[PDB]
Amino acid sequence: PSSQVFICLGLILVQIVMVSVWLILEAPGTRRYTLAEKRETVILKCNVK
């Protein structure tokens, strides 16, 4: 009843902190990605590469 939930929640919280610090460091946004090999096209991309 307790130890499994505690361990799983601990791992989930560790991952949540490790990703929240990354989102804090790198502000989210949208980028107009373009390719010189193709051009004439603009891709609205999530700021994560």
Partner: protein, 48 residues
């Protein structure tokens, strides 16, 4: 894009010269869309 008659310039990666070569306009943006594309299969898969 010909900024002047004698000298030709560029609008940058984001912008493109117009058909009349008189100004720089933002290029259309592309993304995954539900309107008759490869997303119908993934949508049905997610629903199932």
């Amino acid at each position: 894009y010909l900024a002047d008659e004698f000298t030709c310039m560029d609008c940058g990666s984001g912008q493109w010269p117009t058909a009349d070569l008189t100004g720089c306009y933002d290029l259309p943006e592309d993304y995954i869309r539900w309107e008759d594309a490869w997303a119908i299969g993934p949508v049905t898969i997610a629903c199932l």
